[PDB]
Design a protein around this ligand. Structure first.
Ligand SMILES: NC(=O)C1=CN([C@@H]2O[C@H](COP(=O)(O)OP(=O)(O)OC[C@H]3O[C@@H](n4cnc5c(N)ncnc54)[C@H](O)[C@@H]3O)[C@@H](O)[C@H]2O)C=CC1
Length: 290
């Protein structure tokens, strides 16, 4: 009833390319994992669903079919996914969630609305409502942004409504430690937490995708994190990873005794690579779950 896993985010490939290309790239990802030692250490693949971005984003294969392909080249892995609920009518959301569960997904993270909208503002099913209505989904997740306004009220409402895990935004500070200490004090809510850590490549200083992914205009806690990302991208490989490891240790040490099931979520926003997987592997060598 807990996952207690390491999850690697694997984005579906472009529709342009066809199923034969996606499979070949998956065979390459497996070789990358084995060259770094990650094969048995990654229990789940997390496949994000679709939704002014410095990288284009083109039409992708449906999460359902990319899972079919992932299963072929990674025959032991299990699967999680992300689904936006706020823009699908209730009956259509039911069909979509049923398919994902039918196709063997162990857990689904329900996602709400972007920065331009307020809570409840989609014309479809709000994630808070979805957690109640589809209580169908054994492992119902949710996004957790430790730095975001009113998140203690928001995350708690979702736990009340039935969220069983929370998947964090990319963590480039120790704010999550502050959040769950307060959260475990104010509430009896103890959901499994998927701490997300993302490899920052050199080109981030040129392109700024991770800057764009984590932005929050007048926050300052995020600006602290934004300064961290720029520091990482300006760092040569060894100094960068030790910087990341220093954060990882600080986060793991300050969370693991707080009473929440702790899982991991590893992603590479510019795509998987040996430098990312070597960085991931250094992390698990400090702490990994089971
Ligand atoms: N879809 C995915 O796979 C992932 C989603 N996210 C972020 O989660 C957001 C949705 O938040 P939920 O809690 O699921 O929805 P929600 O409907 O429960 O929360 C929406 C509220 O948060 C604000 N908000 C939305 N995105 C924000 C962001 N990136 N930073 C700061 N405030 C933001 C909105 O203005 C609104 O007040 C997406 O916009 C995305 O940026 C992060 C990682 C993964």
């Amino acid at each position: 009833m807990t996952l207690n896993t390491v999850a690697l985010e694997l984005v579906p490939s472009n529709l342009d390319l066809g199923t034969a290309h996606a499979l070949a790239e998956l065979q390459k990802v497996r070789k990358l994992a084995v060259d770094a030692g990650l094969d048995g250490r990654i229990r789940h693949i997390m496949i994000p669903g679709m939704i002014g971005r410095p990288v284009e984003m083109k039409p992708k294969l449906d999460v359902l079919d990319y899972w079919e392909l992932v299963q072929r080249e990674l025959p032991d892995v299990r699967g999680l996914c992300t689904q936006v609920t706020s823009f699908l009518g209730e009956r259509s959301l039911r069909r979509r969630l049923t398919a994902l569960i039918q196709h063997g997904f162990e857990g689904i993270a329900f996602v709400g609305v972007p920065r331009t909208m307020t809570d409840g503002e989609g014309a479809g099913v709000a994630p808070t409502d979805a957690l109640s209505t589809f209580s169908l989904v054994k492992h119902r997740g949710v996004i957790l942004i430790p730095t975001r306004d009113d998140e203690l009220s928001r995350f708690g409402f979702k736990c009340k409504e039935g969220a069983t895990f929370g998947m964090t935004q990319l963590l480039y500070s120790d704010a999550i430690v502050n959040f769950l200490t307060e959260f475990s004090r104010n509430t009896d809510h103890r959901p499994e937490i998927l701490l997300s850590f993302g490899f920052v490549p050199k080109m981030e200083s040129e392109v700024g995708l991770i800057d764009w992914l984590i932005q929050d205009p007048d926050n300052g806690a995020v600006a602290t994190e934004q300064q961290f990302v720029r520091r990482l991208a300006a760092s040569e490989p060894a100094q960068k990873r030790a910087q990341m490891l220093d954060l990882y240790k600080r986060v793991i040490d300050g969370v693991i005794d707080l009473g929440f099931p702790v899982s991991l979520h590893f992603e590479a926003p510019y795509g998987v690579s040996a430098p990312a997987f070597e960085t991931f592997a250094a992390m698990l060598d400090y702490w990994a779950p089971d």
